[PDB]
Symmetry: D2
Subunit: 492 residues, 4 copies
């Protein structure tokens, strides 16, 4: 009874909070305070900044752990996909305000650093081929709308709305199949660099076809592997073929920011709810991002609509809710994060777990897979015994994942030896990674146990588990290729 | 969608078939053929017959196993509770046919062997105190209706319907709180006798209050214990206080035969569906009995209504469907049994398992108990992986019970060392007992395993498990007082 | 849900009780007492008896109404379809497992015994082949065609004596017999002549069968509804295309359990009965629903269970066969049925069931069905003690019965046949209006609607200040139900 | 279910868009363009502006209809409840964490600065005590009452300059202020004088509050609906008894997020909005639904999300505050809203939601509610492209809106106020009928019903040969909806 529940409306937040680190936050002290607020994954927007502009963050991040461990600080690498950008005005951020006048658009660098009013540049050197008369072109957050009057290349366009034409802004051209590659020559260097410094995840930008992901996979190369690929659905194609994409990727990212530019902004409300849902089904994790608290970028107080977005994104099924420029330059970073976390606590506090689990477990099996079967079965026991926690050890993150899907109204303490897994594990809601240093003991029967009890302790530390409580353990033991198949309902 | 399923309508029968053995069936050869048809539990109506009249069956039964093991033949003891009975006519089964005339009813033995027309006897020596004018009294299958005109004791009554007044028939007096004990002086001797020869279960007759069961419990004494108590709801009181009764008993028995006499026959249709359901909830097993195939008592062909009753009783949730005089004297015993089993296969073939499990698991937990939590969780996995069988070892029958409650669309192979448990285990639908003789090996970790694999073999023997199938194992391992808490999703 | 309700378990019975009238019941006085118990439709098994053997019942029935109206006594005509039957013995013989000849040349028709026996199916020699089994008399004697010699050779399988003129059920054989025989038609023309409300067509297999029974009923037919009796396997195989044309089906258990393994009839029933509720067509469950009562005033536990369950499955009608067509306890049987029927429909899940029914629909629904559903909807909301619906074709009160309301469906009508066969629908309570139409299709229908209210008030169905829903039409020209009226009594 | 639908994701927007009119929008031309975008109800924030500052809007609004009718432009009156406000600085001051005095004796009212500051609440010295926090201006500056000295001592907690005449929100303090002030009433009497359709009562706490706003609206009031604005904690605590009397509530996020922790407003909303759908009373979600659009033609992802979600929660109305009362992009904001609204209600679960709604009912339902539900029921069945309903009190079209149909609810009416505030209900499309009554309550209602059909046909709402349901009454004397009519176009 959605109505009954809704009519009738503490625990530890279970949804990650990705944070884009900018100059103003690029320092252990701050980087720590951010993590103290609730920062988990760290976004690395490679759209701006040099290899040192980032290699500086990767270290400061690692520092924050040193200064104070807390929770396995993750480090993501947001590739600067195939994006277009305008050139530079004649002399610094000018104020040329087009009201509805037409003008030329070149791509021969000749005016790259002098474009103004009677002219303007664009990154896409081949735009003259992809774009044709009639095409609209949004510029800067999709503000200025242009209308290609005629390709003359040097193509002719015409403003539609006012607004001044500034320097180096995004050039979104919806309705045009750009012949650009999701991975550029430079893009790869960033990946090889990321895997070099060991970035846990990579938020691939502007994906369209599965092949795209595939490439990001073979480009990540041998070193990649452990690094998960997060496809960022930014255009229409990443929505059209988002199904075949969803298959290969490791998780998708609701790229609202540029999404709302490609497809009509109001559609992003439906496209989100869908993608986020299409992901929970597949089991792959999903991150909702952009302007989740834009106002907090210049204010310690978020607007009603803002917090609503946060929570709703979560209530939709979002696994991760990230902060962009809100912390990458905002005058209120720690405050933003905090507001998020606080909102996140309530969001997942007004969710329908029992039924939702049914729905999730109903669009399955066919039949399910062994590890998924016990994952579901594991969550099942929770609702029955009313388990205060479900301990699960894993090395590939797989198990704790499938466990997160059938989302339990309790925490999913994942004990592990691997340091990367426990890091990107944050990519899953409800998961609480904990690294085990104690090298294996003697048996895959005493070790796993000592590991299981370990989880119990850490849980007890987090208050997650009271004195004489109840809990479920998830471990495997299949002839040779053991891979989760056991369930253990125990008491604390 | 009950409609969808119903619109759209092999496996091993999963519902026991209790059989009352009579002279015509009191012989290994026959007793075997009966078991070959599908006979499981063996009813011992102690209403008629001497200690040798029964001690003869207990052995012949044991013989059938010798001649041919098959399936652990169970032996139940149906106590002849506090029932009333008419005396004997003047000279043998006379034909005195009362049309609506009145007559005297005595209790001083003086006419006990000469009662006829102008007189008739009744067992209840104290009936003169419990019954008062206005009370109706049914005689023989509730055929002859009398109407106590006035207590003269020697109480005056009057026929209401025709029918001849035969010798030694049942005297059902609905609407009268008889001061009789559910356990008589002789009744106990039968119990001590049963436990002496080791009767697995006891179908207590004419229960009314919980206390009744309690007594049958302390009377069973030390030797009892392992023997389960099956309360037979025969009057109104066993329905009124059937809730407090349901608490203590080990299972109830829908005593239709005399039920339909106490409460209006048409109500038995609702009282059944309710009790049977109130039992599935409690987890206690339930048996539906009497006239389930009365016609087969004199015919090799059952009436449409008959098979319907069988199946429906099962579809209601019945755990056991027994045969009374149908095999205790019927001219077609093996045929009756067969018809039952065949009907039983279809009945459980048109059941809604997935949803029913939800309903069952929804009127729970609060929270559930550890062994119940894994039982439910166990059944859960089944529906997911589509397990062809669920192996569960237990010594008290408890676990396989709770597993049977959340009823899986697959067999519940129970491996055990105990010989009694595996016998009365038949009292639960879906259960397939299998005794293990191999004394324990070395560890509660290698033994249980060797036991688990044992189950797999027997299952493979029964065809229950194909080559590369899937299955779930249920075992315990709780600090000291281990008692089921582990689940194992494996492949065959 | 189901568990809660089941865990937790007066109104007027809403399920008809068809009754096969036999010599012992062929008399107004009795025929009345039967109706007094709860008899509604009257079965006319044309398998046995001459045109006077029945024309006598049709009148006695009509008499019972005269002696005492009560409830519009219906009269059904059970055709004696393409059934096979054995000949007559030498002079009025227990086979143990011996073989014997089976002829079809009349030569031994009145002398068949042991070393020989007759069968109606003259063409059986063509349809049956070696290996085929043949049940005789209630499916007791099982034979095994050793070889077609015709004059085909068979062999007993079970004991039992071989009596005269019994049924010859040959399961697993596609008989080339017609669902309607030359004589069969005469019975139909006769029935429509005396005006039989419904006809229980016997041994149907294909839709075509029904079609024939339709064009044979002819012009006079029309108003008479066709009830297909599913007795073999084909009436189950093609029961879907059949269900389309027929007006309702009849779970022919008796011979069904002979054609298909008896235990399957438990599933075949539940299915057909359900496949019918969906289609909206009425369904009747029959045979041995109280066989024991045929020789006893007390029914067995299994018996009453069948009655109620049949109802709880979704059955619209539960008939009594030889239980009243010769049984030593007719009125008693009926009574036991009705009483059982009251409880059965007393433990039903109406709100949810309506949802299920209304969920396997629409697509979208039809106007009259749309308001029928909508009508039942209002009931559950206002908790209406009754839903008044006037109709002349029975259609509306039908679609209303489908979405089955936990309340009575008082149908007011002018037509006398409709109000009779209307009993074929559960929950329906027909009431004939004699008052010729007044002046307007707006004052008349009203005077009609209020009429329903009165009769309801008479039956106690409607208390003083109660609530009720009215169903009437008013569509441009071709008006045909589309209006709903939530009112107070 | 939810997963399948969500996995799988034109019609006329069905959710109103209230708009607060400010100087920049106070002109027919603009006021029209706003209505052209999708503006319906018009908010009149009486917090700022003189009786002419508003009497000017009431006319310009009325003008927009003249210039171009379109859709019955509604006019709401947002009372400026018991709000507190700071005084004026010395001559038109950034506290970092320093303490300071707070007076209430007017002496410093026009000179308060740094070492002092004023507050409206003259009795604040009694309600507030040491330890209490006090937010100022959009809840930016947080103070901490060090000690009541009155003239109470406080201390800044955050930076920010201390400007003149800003709001003084003191969460956690039961203010003894009246929901209706001496001046407040004058505004009401004024509103009812110029005929304001609805009144958004501000800062309600107890039912009594509403009651007062009811007897203050007086005789002239009546037709004017009272919309309680839940702004503090008490309007949430006793929001249940309030919900009983009021005509609808307003999720007062803006000040709500100040009283209760901002993150809680996400749960408080979903609850209230839901607690309202149940009661049947309409609900409006407001404040910052597109704050960014106040200075931009492009809304942020979070913004549109809020709009739609607010709708998807069950919101009946989504208003725009300063977004159009001063924003540099008014028409654009409205547009973005409407567009978002179209998709929101396009991804809703109607069939099931109706079930849920109709399941937390009846008990039993009321006659007009019973047919309202029943009416919506038929829609889902026949797949009606529209449901015509005539009413004069708005009641019926309301109860019809509750059980929310996936189709438009064309309400035909004679009353001009009803058809105006009727916008307060989602799915409703008011249409005034000028044609004075004909001769019968049977030909008139009809001519009225067909009228609805035409207007519907005009809006494209109804295709050629479509299907539709009509809702009308006819109960003995006190007729008040009880009839349903499933018809074809
Ligand atoms: O990491 P995954 O893919 O979820 O697999 C979990 C694995 O970890 C275990 O629980 C323990 O394995 P190890 O002892 O090798 O760490 C296995 O039983 C199971 O195969
Ligand atoms: O018989 P129950 O009551 O169901 O208990 C089952 C018990 O059997 C086991 O599965 C195996 O125990 P044993 O090795 O002693 O036979 C235990 O783990 C569990 O406690
Ligand atoms: O269900 P049916 O048999 O079509 O009857 C419904 C008809 O009866 C009425 O309610 C009344 O019409 P009549 O006066 O002709 O009986 C019509 O409005 C409607 O078309
Ligand atoms: O919902 P409301 O405002 O009570 O209006 C419904 C009323 O309008 C009607 O449909 C038509 O009556 P009027 O001509 O007076 O408007 C009545 O039958 C019904 O009582
Ligand atoms: K017949
Ligand atoms: K205000
Ligand atoms: Mn982007
Ligand atoms: Mn008994
Ligand atoms: Mn037949
Ligand atoms: Mn406010």
């Amino acid at each position: 009874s959605r109505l009954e529940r809704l009519t009738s409306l503490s625990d530890l937040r279970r949804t990650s909070i990705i944070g884009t680190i900018g100059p103003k936050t690029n320092n252990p002290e701050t980087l720590v305070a951010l993590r103290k607020a609730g920062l988990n994954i760290v976004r690395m927007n490679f759209s701006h900044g040099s290899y040192e502009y980032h290699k500086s963050v990767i270290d400061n991040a690692r520092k924050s752990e040193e200064l104070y461990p807390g929770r396995p600080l993750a480090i993501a690498l947001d590739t600067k996909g195939p994006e277009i950008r305008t050139g530079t005005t004649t002399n610094d951020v000018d104020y040329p305000i087009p009201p509805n006048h037409e003008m030329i658009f070149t791509t021969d660098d000749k005016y790259a650093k002098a474009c103004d009013d009677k002219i303007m540049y664009v990154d896409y050197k081949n735009i003259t081929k992809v774009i044709s008369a009639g095409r609209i072109i949004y510029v800067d957050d999709g503000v200025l709308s242009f209308q290609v009057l005629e390709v003359v290349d040097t193509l002719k366009v015409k403003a539609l709305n006012a607004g001044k034409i500034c320097s180096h802004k995004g050039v979104n051209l919806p309705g045009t199949d750009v012949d650009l590659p999701a991975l550029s020559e430079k893009d790869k260097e960033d990946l090889r660099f990321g895997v070099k410094n060991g970035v846990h995840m990579v938020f691939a930008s502007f994906i369209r076809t599965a092949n795209d992901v595939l490439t990001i996979r073979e480009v990540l190369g041998e070193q990649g592997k452990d690094v998960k690929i997060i496809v960022k659905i930014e255009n229409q194609q990443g929505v059209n073929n988002f199904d075949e994409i969803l298959k290969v990727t490791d998780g998708v990212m609701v790229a609202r920011g540029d999404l709302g530019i490609e497809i009509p902004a109001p559609e992003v409300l439906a496209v989100q709810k869908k993608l986020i849902a299409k992901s929970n089904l597949a089991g792959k994790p999903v991150i909702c991002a952009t302007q989740m608290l834009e106002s907090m970028t210049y204010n310690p107080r978020p607007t009603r609509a803002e917090v609503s977005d946060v929570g709703n994104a979560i209530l939709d099924g979002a696994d991760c809710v990230m902060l962009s420029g809100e912390t990458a330059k905002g005058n209120y970073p720690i405050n933003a994060v905090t507001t998020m976390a606080e909102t996140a606590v309530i969001a997942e506090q007004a969710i329908a777990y029992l039924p939702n689990y049914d729905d999730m477990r109903n669009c399955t099996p066919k039949p399910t897979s062994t590890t998924e079967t016990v994952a579901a079965s594991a969550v099942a026991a929770v609702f029955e015994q009313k388990a205060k926690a479900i301990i699960v050890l894993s090395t590939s993150g797989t198990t704790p994942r499938l466990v997160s899907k059938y989302r339990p109204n309790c925490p999913i303490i994942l004990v592990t030896r691997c340091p990367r897994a426990a890091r990107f594990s944050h990519l899953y809601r409800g998961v609480f990674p904990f690294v085990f240093e104690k090298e294996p003991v003697s048996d895959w029967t005493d070790d796993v146990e000592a590991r299981i009890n370990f989880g119990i302790e850490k849980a007890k530390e987090f208050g997650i588990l009271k004195k004489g409580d109840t809990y479920v353990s998830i471990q495997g033991f299949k002839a040779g290729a053991g891979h989760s198949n056991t369930l253990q309902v125990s008491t604390v």
